[PDB]
A paper describes a structure:
The NatA complex is responsible for the majority of N-terminal acetylation of proteins with a serine, alanine, threonine, cysteine or valine at their N terminus after the cleavage of the N-terminal methionine by the methionine-amino peptidase120. It consists of the auxiliary subunit Naa15 and the catalytic subunit Naa10. Here we present the structural analysis of HypK in complex with NatA from the thermophilic fungus Chaetomium thermophilum. Our study shows that HypK acts a negative regulator of the NAT activity of NatA and sets the ground for a molecular understanding of HypK role in co-translational processes.
To characterize the HypK–NatA complex at the molecular level, we determined the structure of the HypK-THB bound to NatA (Naa15-Naa10ΔC). Diffraction data were collected up to 2.6 Å resolution, and the structure was determined by molecular replacement with the SpNatA structure as a search model (PDB: 4KVM20) and refined to Rwork and Rfree values of 16.1% and 22.0%, respectively. The electron density map was of high quality, showing well-defined density for the CoA-SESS bi-substrate and HypK-THB. The active site harbours the CoA-SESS bi-substrate analogue, which binds between strands β4 and β5, perpendicular to their plane for CoA-SASEA in SpNatA20. During structure building and refinement, extra density appeared in close proximity to Naa15 TPR-C that could be unambiguously assigned to HypK-THB. HypK-THB contacts the TPR-C and helix α38 of Naa15 through an extended interface with a buried surface area of 786 Å2. The interaction involves hydrogen bonds and salt bridges between HypK (α3, α5, the loop connecting HypK α3 and α4) and Naa15 (α36, α38 and the loop connecting α35 and α36). The contact involves an extended hydrophobic interface between HypK-α3 and α5 (α3: Ala87, Val89, Leu91, Leu92; α5: Ala114, Ile115, Met118, Ile122) and helices α36 and α38 of Naa15 (α36: Leu689, Leu690, Leu692, Leu695; α38: Met726, Ala727, Leu730, Val733, Ile734, Ala736).
Numbering used by the authors:
A (entry chain I): 2 to 5
B (entry chain A): 7 to 358, 366 to 573, 638 to 742
C (entry chain B): 1 to 179
D (entry chain C): 81 to 125
The structure:
Amino acid sequence: SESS
Amino acid sequence: TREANLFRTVIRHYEDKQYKRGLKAAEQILKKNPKHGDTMSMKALILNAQGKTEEAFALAKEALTIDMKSYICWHVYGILYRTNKNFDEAIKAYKFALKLEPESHQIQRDLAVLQIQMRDYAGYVQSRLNMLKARPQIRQNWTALAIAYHLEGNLEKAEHILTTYEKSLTTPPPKTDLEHSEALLYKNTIIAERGDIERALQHLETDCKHCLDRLAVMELRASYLSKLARKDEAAKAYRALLDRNPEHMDYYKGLISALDISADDEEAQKAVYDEYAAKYPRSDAAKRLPLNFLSGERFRTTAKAYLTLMFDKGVPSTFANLKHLYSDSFKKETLASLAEEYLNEYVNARPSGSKGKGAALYYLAQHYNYYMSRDLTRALEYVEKAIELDPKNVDFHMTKARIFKHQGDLAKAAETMDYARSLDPKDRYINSKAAKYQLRNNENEKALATMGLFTRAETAGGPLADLTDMQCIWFLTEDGEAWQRRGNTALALKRYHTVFSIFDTWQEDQFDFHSFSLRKGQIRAYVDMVRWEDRLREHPFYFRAALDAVNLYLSMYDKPKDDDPNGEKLAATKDPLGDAMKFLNYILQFSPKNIDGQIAGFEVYIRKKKYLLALRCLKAASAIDKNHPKVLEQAAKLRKIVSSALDSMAPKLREVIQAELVGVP
Amino acid sequence: MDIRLLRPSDIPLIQHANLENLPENYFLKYYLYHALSWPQLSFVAVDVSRPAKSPYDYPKIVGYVLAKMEEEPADGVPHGHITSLSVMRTHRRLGIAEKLMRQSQLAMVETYNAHYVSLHVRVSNKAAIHLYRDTLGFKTEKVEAKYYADGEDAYCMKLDLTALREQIAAQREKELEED
Amino acid sequence: MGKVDPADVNLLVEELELSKAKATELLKAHDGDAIKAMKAYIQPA
Ligand SMILES: *C(=O)CSCCNC(=O)CCNC(=O)[C@H](O)C(C)(C)COP(=O)(O)OP(=O)(O)OC[C@H]1O[C@@H](n2cnc3c(N)ncnc32)[C@H](O)[C@@H]1OP(=O)(O)O
C-alpha cells in the first residue's frame, strides 16, 4: 500500500 | 493612459496574490473614475479571494450593471459563481462573456467544462464544435466532439466525427499508439450501442484486432459472437477468456451456453469445470462452482472433497465462500454433516498442526450462527471448542462476539469483539469491527478512541476529523445512529449532513476529468464514469444516512472556519420538514423502487399539507407492495384528510386526488 | 467470489474496503484518477451470490487491487506500481490477492509493456510479504525508513516481468501462425 | 406550440413543488391539460  | 497601465498592475498584483498591492492600486483608479466597471470587477475578485464573498458578489453585480457589454465583468461574475459551486449561474455568465469576446480560448474552455458537468448536452456540443473549429490539428478536440454527441444521444453523429478523423490520417498509426487504440475501441462500442452487432464484430476483427486493451477485444468478441448465435466460435472465445481468468463466473456460463449443454445435464457441465480445474489447479472457481448445480450424492461427494482441501489448509473463510448454497436446504444440511464427518475423521497432522480441526469447528460455529441455519446455543459450543484449541485466534473470538450480538447481548458482544481486536492490534479490519460493535452498544466516545488507533496521529480535530477527511461513511452513519439513539439530535444530524456533503464532493470530483480524460485518451472509462455519476446517489451509502435524516426531522416535527461544529444550529431548526427536503428529493428521485423511502416521503408530505405529492408516494409504495402494513395504514390515513380538507383545495386538485385515490387502497 | 475488472461505479465500495482493511487511505478522487488513467490494471473480488437487501445494491466488494503505470519511467523503461491491495478479513486465504495480482500484472505487460512491477509493504506484514515473495516472486530492493504515517519501515519490492513478457510473446507467435 | 393557463402553472408549482419552468414544461407536455398532467406525474415507473 502507498503511504499518506 | 496612466490608469490604463495601472489597471494592468492590478491584474499583475492579483496573479501574484498581492491583494494589498492591487487594491491600493485599483482604489486610485476608482477615485478618479468611480464608474469604471472593469476595475470594479477586478476588485471584486480580490475581495472574493479573501472571504469577502457577499461583498464581492454585490460589487461584481454592480459592475456589470455599469458596463453590461464588458466581457471582463461577466467573466468575473462567472468565476465567483463557479467558486461558490453554483455552476448553473456560472454557465449563464460565461456564455455571455463568450458572446462578447468570442476569441477568448479560456472562457470557451471553462464554459465547456461547466456545461458537461451540468449535463447541458446541447451546450457542450456547440462548445466542442467551436473548440474543434479553432484547433482541428489536435486529435483530442475531435474525440471530445464525438463524446459530446455520444452523451447527447446522437450516436450516428458521434461515429461520423470519429470516422472523419480516421479518414484524415495519411499514415496508419503504429499499434503502440494507445490514443489511436482507445479511439478504435470507443468507436466500436458506439457501433454496438447503435444496435448493429453484425457491423461491430466486423469492425472489431478488421480494425481493432491488435488494440492494446486485450481483455476488451476478447470480451467484445465473445459477446458479439454469442448474440449472433455463432456458437462454435463463441465457444472458442469464452475458452480464451477462461484461460485468461479462470475465476470469472460468466465465462463458464458463456462457454456452457455455446456448447448447447442443458442446465439439467449435471454431469456434462461438470466435465467443462473439471477440465479447467485440471488445467488450473489453483482456481477455486473451477472446483467450487459445480456445487451450484450438483445435487444428491454427486453434490455430497464433490462437497466432501472440496471441504477436505480447505479444512486441511486450515482456511477460516471456507464458510463465507460456501454460504450462498444455503438457499437449498439439502446442501445446507449436507455441508454441516460433512464438516461433522471431517471432524470425526481428523487426526493431528504434524504430530512430531491442528488447523484442520479448528477450521471444521469454526465452520460449524458459523453454520449455526447463520440465520438460515441458526442455532445460537450450538454455535456457542462449537466456537468455544475452537477457542479451546486456538485461544489466540482472532476470527474465532470475532465469531463468538457475533453470536452474543444475535443473542441480543450487545455489551458482551462489544467486550468480546474488542478482546478479539487486542489479539491483532496491527489489523484494521478487526479494529473497525470493535468500533462498530461499541457504537452498536451506544458507546460513541469509546468507539471513536478505538478508531483513533488507526487514524493519523496529529490530525487536528482528532480521529473524527481524519475520518471525515477520508470520507468514511460507514463510521459517520453508525456514529449518527448511535447519537440519535442516545437522544443527541444535534450530533446525529451533523453526521447525516456530513454524509450528504461527501456525496456533493463525489459529484464535484468528476469536474477536472472532463479535460483530463481527453489527455489520457482512455475514453470508454470516461463515459463509464459519467454514466455512473448520473446515478450517483442511488447508492445505498447515500440512501441509509439520508433516510435517517428524514426520519429524524419527522420526529423533530412531532416533538417540538467550520460553523456549527456540533450541529446545534441544525437541531434548533424552526423548519425541520423544510430541512428534510434536500435529503428526501434524492431519495425519491434516485431510489424510487425503495418502499422505505416512499413511506417516509408520504409522512413528510401530509405534514407539509401537500396531499398530491403524498398520493404520489403512496401510489409508488403500493405499486411495490400492495399489502405492506404501512401503505395500508397511510392509505386509510390519507382518505380521512382528503374528505376533511377538500372544501379548501382547488377544484382541479380535488378532482385528481379523488380520481387517482380510488385506484389502489 | 468472482474476479473481474474494476468499474467506476465500484469505487465507493472499493474505497470502503480500503477504509476497513488498511491504514493508508485516499480521497475518492484518487481512485477516479487510477480508473480513468489505467482502466485496464485494477481488479476487484466480488461476492456475487450475496442476496440483495435492496433494489439498488451495488456489487459487494470483498477484495481489490489498485494499480498504475509509473508516469516517470526510471530510464524510459515502463513499469507498474501497486497503489493498494486488500481483502476483507472474512475472505482471506482463498487465493484472492494472488489472482488479483496476476490479472493486474498481465495487463501491465500487454497494454503498457511493463518491464517490472513494484510496491511498498510494512516490514512486519508477514501475510503480505509471503504473498509477494513466496507466491509471486517479488525480490526486495531496499528499506524505506518511516515510510508509513505511524513510522513503520517499508520494503520496496520489485517483480521482474521478463518471464511473463516472453511467455506472452510465445503465445503471440502461435496466434500469428494461425493468422 | 402549446399555450398554458397561468393559474394552472401556479397550481402545479404549489402542489407538485416544481419550478415555474418545469411546471410549464409538464403542462405543455399535456397540451395545457392540468388534470391530465397532474395525473400523469403521480403515476409510478
Ligand atoms: C500495498 O498495497 C502492498 S501491502 C498491503 C497489503 N494489504 C494489507 O495488509 C491489508 C490486510 N491484509 C490483507 O488484505 C490480506 O491478508 C493480503 C492482501 C495481504 C493477502 O490476501 P489473501 O488472503 O487473499 O492472500 P492469498 O491469495 O489468499 O494467499 C496467497 C499467499 O499469501 C500467503 N498468505 C496469505 N495469508 C497469509 C497469512 N495469514 N499468513 C501467512 N501467509 C499468508 C500464502 O502464502 C498464500 O500462498 P499459498 O501458497 O500458501 O496459497
